[PDB]
Amino acid sequence: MENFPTEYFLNTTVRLLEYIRYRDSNYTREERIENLHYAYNKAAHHFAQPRQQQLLKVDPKRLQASLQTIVGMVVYSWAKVSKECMADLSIHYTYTLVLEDSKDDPYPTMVNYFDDLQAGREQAHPWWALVNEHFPNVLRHFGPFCSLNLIRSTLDFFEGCWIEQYNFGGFPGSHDYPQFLRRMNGLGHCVGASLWPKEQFNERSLFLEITSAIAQMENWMVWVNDLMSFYKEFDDERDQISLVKNYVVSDEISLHEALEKLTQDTLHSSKQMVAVFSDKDPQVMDTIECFMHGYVTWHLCDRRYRLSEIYEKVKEEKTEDAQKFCKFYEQAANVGAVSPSEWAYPPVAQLANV
Amino acid sequence: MENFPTEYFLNTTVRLLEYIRYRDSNYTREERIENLHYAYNKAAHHFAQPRQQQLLKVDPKRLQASLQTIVGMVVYSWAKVSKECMADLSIHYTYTLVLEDSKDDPYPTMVNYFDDLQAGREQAHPWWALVNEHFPNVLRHFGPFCSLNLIRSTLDFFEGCWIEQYNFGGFPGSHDYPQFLRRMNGLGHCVGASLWPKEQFNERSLFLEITSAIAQMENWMVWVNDLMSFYKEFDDERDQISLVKNYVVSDEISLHEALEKLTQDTLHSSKQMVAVFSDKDPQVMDTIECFMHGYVTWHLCDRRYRLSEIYEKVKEEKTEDAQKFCKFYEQAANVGAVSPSEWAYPPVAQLANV
Numbered sequence A, B: 001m002e003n004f005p006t007e008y009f010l011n012t013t014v015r016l017l018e019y020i021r022y023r024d025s026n027y028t029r030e031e032r033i034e035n036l037h038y039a040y041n042k043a044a045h046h047f048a049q050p051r052q053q054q055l056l057k058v059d060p061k062r063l064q065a066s067l068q069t070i071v072g073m074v075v076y077s078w079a080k081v082s083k084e085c086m087a088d089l090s091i092h093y094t095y096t097l098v099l100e101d102s103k104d105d106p107y108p109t110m111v112n113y114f115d116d117l118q119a120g121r122e123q124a125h126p127w128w129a130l131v132n133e134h135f136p137n138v139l140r141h142f143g144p145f146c147s148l149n150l151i152r153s154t155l156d157f158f159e160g161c162w163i164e165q166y167n168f169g170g171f172p173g174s175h176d177y178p179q180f181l182r183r184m185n186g187l188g189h190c191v192g193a194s195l196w197p198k199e200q201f202n203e204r205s206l207f208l209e210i211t212s213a214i215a216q217m218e219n220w221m222v223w224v225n226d227l228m229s230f231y232k233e234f235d236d237e238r239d240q241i242s243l244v245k246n247y248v249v250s251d252e253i254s255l256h257e258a259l260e261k262l263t264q265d266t267l268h269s270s271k272q273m274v275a276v277f278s279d280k281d282p283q284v285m286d287t288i289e290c291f292m293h294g295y296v297t298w299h300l301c302d303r304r305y306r307l308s309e310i311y312e313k314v315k316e317e318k319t320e321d322a323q324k325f326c327k328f329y330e331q332a333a334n335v336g337a338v339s340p341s342e343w344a345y346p347p348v349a350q351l352a353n354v
């Protein structure tokens, strides 16, 4: 603890950007801004509705902040899905993100989940009521198999949050707990399966590719975040339980051993990501290659992860990592750094109030 | 490999039985036969119903054989749940087992899964129709959290079977595939969460214990089966995709290296199983301790796994392992070896025909 392993999280970072073949960029600053606003505008209007405004107990500023964070992530990572697809996914991923804010015990609202579900009665928990109502707008872009994947992962995520409320990092010696919890709320199968709109792909035709992509992308996606993320949590305990911190508590190892473990899985998931899809269907490899780069581009740009600080304290160095850290860093900014004022407007609150 | 790793097998097996503290219990044969018949009787009557007889496309003999295999597993492992609970779980686990028999492509029957579900219209796929109809009888024995777990795992399992239809062992270099598939159809969270009936336990009170148990049991349960199963799935050219066989195809290692890998995870899951729950709530450790032993007892007794063959071949060897194994086996038999004629009757077909 204390004093960030500042270099390893640069080297590792470059190792990652190199492995994934951090080519240049996905869009052109204007294509991004174009999508950003399209997605944001549809979402903002959605969450601004009376019903949504009522059932979704969340602080306005938080909602605004979250919506904007999700839209960016989607628009920069699902680089090849229609504008509509970006938007709808953005609504769904905003719902999931906003659910992490609930402090309300699910228990009582989940006592009749299955009977209500099976009988088509509106769910008790208001979140389920909204998400299941909105789901068709997401699900329409996909085939039956990929849809099943989104449905499951979202269910898994609901359980994931329930567990998170107990702020439990696992019993010492419970090695299987950390990843069990990480998968539970990583939305991995939701992400990986949403990368294949039936309009651009055919599940039946690319079933083995898609299935393999879901399998592999799930871990790359969660671990790449856990890494980039380790910065805004190295100093924050208000987020006590985390894959790295749970490894420590569960596997009984040092924060460094834990952070080392993650770094090994991450670089490895990367190496294999490429080894498998490089020679596969071009369109497939392209969606994958783009999601990775976009995903990394987003982490480096969203103020959220405060990665700009790592920039500051590493702009004058002359290493073969401290430079490979900003050589890429900058690349991200030149195409992904965009002032919200250019796309995120008007504020959800304003639309809602109207 | 060419010949079975008998030596290696017998050892691993003992290390496993030792690690988990495999010892005789107070669950008497009379008690077993009593439960066996109770569960079987209720199930048989269930599957013998006209509707079940219609919608569940399965060969009678296979159904008979499966029902009997599932009842035994349940009754010998959920040693502390009510007779009714053993029965109901037996119906559910029989449904799941019988689904592996379908070659029918799920795709067309799953094109409207979510819309039908959300609207409360009977599912298109007949299996979902039956299982979701019968679900409340299982779910009544549990609290909301544990129920959510059963619901998810079962969904996961349905997808697991869909993937299995493609008889795909993973693309070479796709290390994440094997376990992805194994978890998908291991029903781990269904098993682990069904161990805590709300009549004997309180989710809210033992939440951390239960959650941890689900996380840990999932891997112990699937790997312990993959191991015991190894002897029968060795010379079965019919059995192509399996965790061990997929490790070979996916991780590009030898069948021995793969088998070796499994053996390490298995023994390890075991040690940690004990290290964690030994000092926890007595009732918890007891349900866990019993499930493991019962589960192992069942594998050694069910003719299915043809384990009696390794026994005979070794029963007259003055080896450290060999003899250590043979006694464990004998123990299992003396309490778990029971003639079907003592509990499984009349045959489902007969009841159905009536």
Ligand SMILES: CC(C)=CCC[N@@H+](C)[C@@H]1CC=C(C)CC1
Pocket (backbone or CB within 6 Å): A070, A073, A093, A094, A096, A097, A098, A185, A186, A187, A188, A221, A222, A225
């Ligand atoms: C979008 C964020 C905050 C992080 C990326 C990591 N994923 C595992 C996310 C988990 C939570 C949601 C809502 C979506 C995907």
Ligand SMILES: CC(C)=CCC[N@@H+](C)[C@@H]1CC=C(C)CC1
Pocket (backbone or CB within 6 Å): B069, B070, B073, B092, B093, B094, B096, B097, B185, B186, B187, B191, B221, B222, B225
């Ligand atoms: C019960 C058999 C045949 C094998 C053990 C492997 N487990 C993963 C089972 C999968 C099928 C069910 C219903 C329960 C758990």
Ligand SMILES: [Mg+2]
Pocket (backbone or CB within 6 Å): A100
């Ligand atoms: Mg979060």
Ligand SMILES: [Mg+2]
Pocket (backbone or CB within 6 Å): A225, A226, A229, A230, A242
């Ligand atoms: Mg994180």
